[PDB]
Design a protein around this nucleic acid. Sequence first.
RNA 1: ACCGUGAGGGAAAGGUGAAAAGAACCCCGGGAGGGGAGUGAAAUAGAGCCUGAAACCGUGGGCUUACAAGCAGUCACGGCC
RNA 2: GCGAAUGCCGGCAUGAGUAACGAUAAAGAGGGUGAGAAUCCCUCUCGCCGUAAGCCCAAGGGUUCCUACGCAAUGGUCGUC
RNA 3: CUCGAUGUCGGCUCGUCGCAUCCUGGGGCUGAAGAAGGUCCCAAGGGUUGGGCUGUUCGCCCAUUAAAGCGGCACGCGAGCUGGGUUCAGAACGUCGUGAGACAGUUCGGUCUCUAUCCGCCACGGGCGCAGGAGGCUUGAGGGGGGCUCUUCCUAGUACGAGAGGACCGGAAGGGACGCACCUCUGGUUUCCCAGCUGUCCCUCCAGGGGCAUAAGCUGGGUAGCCAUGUGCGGAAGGGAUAACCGCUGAAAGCAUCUAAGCGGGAAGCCCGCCCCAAGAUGAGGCCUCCCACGGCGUCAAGCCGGUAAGGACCCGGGAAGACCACCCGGUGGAUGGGCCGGGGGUGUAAGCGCCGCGAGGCGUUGAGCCGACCGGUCCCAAUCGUCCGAGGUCUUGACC
Lengths: 206, 117, 122, 117, 57
Amino acid sequence: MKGILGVKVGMTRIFRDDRAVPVTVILAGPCPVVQRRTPEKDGYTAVQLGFLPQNPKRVNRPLKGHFAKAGVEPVRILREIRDFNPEGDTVTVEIFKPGERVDVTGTSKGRGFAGVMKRWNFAGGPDSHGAHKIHRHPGSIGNRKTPGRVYKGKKMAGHYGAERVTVMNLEVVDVIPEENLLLVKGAVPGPNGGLVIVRETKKAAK
Amino acid sequence: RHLKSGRKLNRHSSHRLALYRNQAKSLLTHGRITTTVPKAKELRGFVDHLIHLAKRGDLHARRLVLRDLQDVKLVRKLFDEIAPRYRDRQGGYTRVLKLAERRRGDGAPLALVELVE
Amino acid sequence: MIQPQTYLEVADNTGARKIMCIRVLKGSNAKYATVGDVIVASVKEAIPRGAVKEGDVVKAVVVRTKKEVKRPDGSAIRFDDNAAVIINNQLEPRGTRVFGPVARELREKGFMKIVSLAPEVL
Amino acid sequence: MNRGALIKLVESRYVRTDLPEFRPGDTVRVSYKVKEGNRTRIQDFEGIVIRIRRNGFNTTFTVRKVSYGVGVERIFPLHSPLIQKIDIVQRGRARRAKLYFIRNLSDREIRRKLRAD
Amino acid sequence: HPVPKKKTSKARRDARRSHHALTPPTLVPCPECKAMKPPHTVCPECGYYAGRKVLEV
RNA sequence: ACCGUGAGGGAAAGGUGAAAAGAACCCCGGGAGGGGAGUGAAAUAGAGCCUGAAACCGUGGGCUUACAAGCAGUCACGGCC
RNA sequence: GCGAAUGCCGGCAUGAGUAACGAUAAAGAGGGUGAGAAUCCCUCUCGCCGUAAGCCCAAGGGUUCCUACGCAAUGGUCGUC
RNA sequence: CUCGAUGUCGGCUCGUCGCAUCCUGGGGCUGAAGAAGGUCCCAAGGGUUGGGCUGUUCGCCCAUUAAAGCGGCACGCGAGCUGGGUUCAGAACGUCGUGAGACAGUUCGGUCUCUAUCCGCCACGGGCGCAGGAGGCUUGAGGGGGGCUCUUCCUAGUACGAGAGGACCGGAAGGGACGCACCUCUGGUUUCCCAGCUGUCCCUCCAGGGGCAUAAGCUGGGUAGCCAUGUGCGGAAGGGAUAACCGCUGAAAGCAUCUAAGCGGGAAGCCCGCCCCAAGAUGAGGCCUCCCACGGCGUCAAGCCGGUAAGGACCCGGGAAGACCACCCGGUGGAUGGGCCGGGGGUGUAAGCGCCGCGAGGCGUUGAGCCGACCGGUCCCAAUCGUCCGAGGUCUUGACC
């Protein structure tokens, strides 16, 4: 219940009796680059890859990190726990029976550095009745001899883009077995034309 | 709100434009000029298409790049004097090359960029 | 597309094709009445004679502008905002009524009466 | 490859031609019957007659709010391939300059005035 | 408005200006002359990587 | 000198040497100013140049330091030199 | 014979190489001069004024004005201007 | 403590803990038949709307709600706004005063400053370390985030019942507000992308343009990015121990009791499961691949030097990463930027000539012309040449070959 992905963009698709929209994933398919067996690692499971950048380009140690169960010329590699690898290669070309339910994740489009304004919700102050820190603002940070200070970990200034995350459960809508692609109808949990993965948790009894 | 950006420039837009034009022109004149890093990069993209049209050659082309340069002498001189020598290549009729030094007091890294021969 | 304090257009027995809506009547945290929503409001416009008067009803929103985005991936916006007065239950109050179709309405359904009631060109 | 490539594809399939309808017109008032229905697939060759307002463009595109006066301002926004749609016969004639979002229309129209165009 | 309290001595003073501190300018040699060439650059001679155009009068 | 409209107020700044012998001329610099030669009893007496000490700023050396809570310190002990 | 009198006089550190560089009327290129010129000299692109950033009388100011040389101090760094 | 100063109301923005818990679930009790109520006990989880009149906090009312909680921090918050407020000269009334002036009686006005040093907080890096020196892959103690709730429907209008009403039980659906992402759809922006336009000075008279009418003159539209009013999604299951409350198996109370013996039952709560940080968790690193023991000198020579591109630097070119910076991909053995090019999306039929109209223009050539980011080619141009740094590998023990 795993799949690695170089994702494209999202685009409307029609579903049955109504159109609706999904998003584009592409995965050449990984290949148990490394396994972590339990004697090795008890965080036991799989480390795979799903593509390949110019050949010369491979660091030596890499050349061999491959040597091992040998593979090809990528760089798109990463692992995951309790994830078995009943294969030497896996491409979703079934791996993910469409009209199946998935959970997914990846890089979070590098935002910027936004005042209470953007970062957190409930932005700024007002504007007219008293505008020198105008419309937008930064609330109050605590107080005198109550905690004799400014608090410790409540929302705050700048940097909130160069970050990542995952979107819970959504649609595996359809699987295009050739051009290893999946249309899902999700938030593209981060840019498009870039990276994410798919995994499917849910002892989920509605 | 912002991060992705296409093309990108300083001063102000009417200003910039003013620049692009003036420079584009002066350079046309000497085939090579010196300014600061950026100035170069850009005047490059710019004079790049202008001149592509320069070759394009004829009624319309003249009409446009002229729309910018405003002037027979230069205008035409390009159009017929150099455009030719350029008619064959696939663009990038410009070459941006970073110089030795920097302007005084400011310490600005300059370049020389010319029409490529 | 919606509204809180609103100049809601009407039609039918309303002694005023407009009322001012207080609050979207839905879940205790209203914030927007749209096509199909029922709302809480009173009369803003004057009732020639009429039966309506100058008090207040609860009723149902029809039309609205700013995106009639429907399930079928089809849509429409009416350069107009209205509702039909709703006698408790819902059951609209007047005979005729000046307006037309757009499933949305129908889909809320409860008012199928309204449904059949104002089919044609206006 | 990328984007262009593959998506180009996905849609390629689901939409094929948005339904070889091809005759678009911009002003044309025209009428269609979409499977628009519900209540025991009372999918009725439903037809609306409207003055063509606009159009979104790529796989998914939109036969825009062709605006029609029932006895009210009813403007209808439909997605192009939308299987929803069946009939798209045209009536008026795709005219007038300053194109799309030709709202002048419902803007401050006046049947005559539209008719002045 | 809000002004310090002393200056945690030279001690701090430097601490800060400290981690600040200077650095050097990067150089290699003229693929033509000899001297210090910083990546893409010419200089009062070799003025090139093929076709000077620069240095003289 | 300088503040003030004026009445009016009202600073700072002293010393090279025994005497000019106070800097030819050679050297880097656009210059200063820096290194030489001569001064000489001295020039860390060199031109605001006697004595020129405190604050403060610098170059070098010994010891010391990245799990550390202490204005201070200072009692013990140990490693260093 | 004085830490210590928001003390006096003088130096001298301190945020601190941060704040700003005095009006959003814009610059950019090309030769010239120099020891060095974003920052001086000509030339060519562009903008801002003009009913003022006009030209003139007077007031007050009084050196400067020109001409040659010249910058180390002075122009809020620049500078050979 | 405070008068060489601790800016006193209300509001705003931001809150953070308490339960005496409004709403929530868990409960025994009933003067409980159902439904619904009233009454204590258990427990903070989240939740705890909009208006009106008032400078009011409070309050009364309009409409809601599941709920529309009370209260702590100087009645939290002016080095974070507001300044209506009370608490500066005016002036005003009415009220006192023989008047001067006054009134915790009212009324109209009335100069709230702000480059953060520190500790604190939010983020971004430079260190130096977790004794070979190397590029990537992970496990997480522990820390953070999320934990809400209403309406419908079957179960059944069956259990209750006279009747009107209407269940536990358990199973669907659909909203509200909220939280995390994200453009396709919808919709806003789009400072030069296109288009119509007026006054004027200039190009060369015409037309065809040009700047200036903001730092876009004006208007009508408008990719990409970013962005909601738009799109997906979640707040779960489920497991372990508990809360009041309920028992069982049982003596001391040779009859009785859940209660020292021992076993179980039980809340949105606690612990885990969900997601996101994370060994600078001086207690890691854990696995993966990989480079091998250079040289001259006072020695536990853990010091000075070439070392391996082992690798990585620096510099160049770039990047939805981004203040710098680190992040990251390329560096011509290229596609990395720009150019061109093709193509999507735009504006909306071009400039010229042609035809009908005295003229204004129309129609044609013309869905024409000009085009920024958007999908993808192609060494046209610029990613040249180089520089530097970077292991030899402590001692003790034990275990093996």
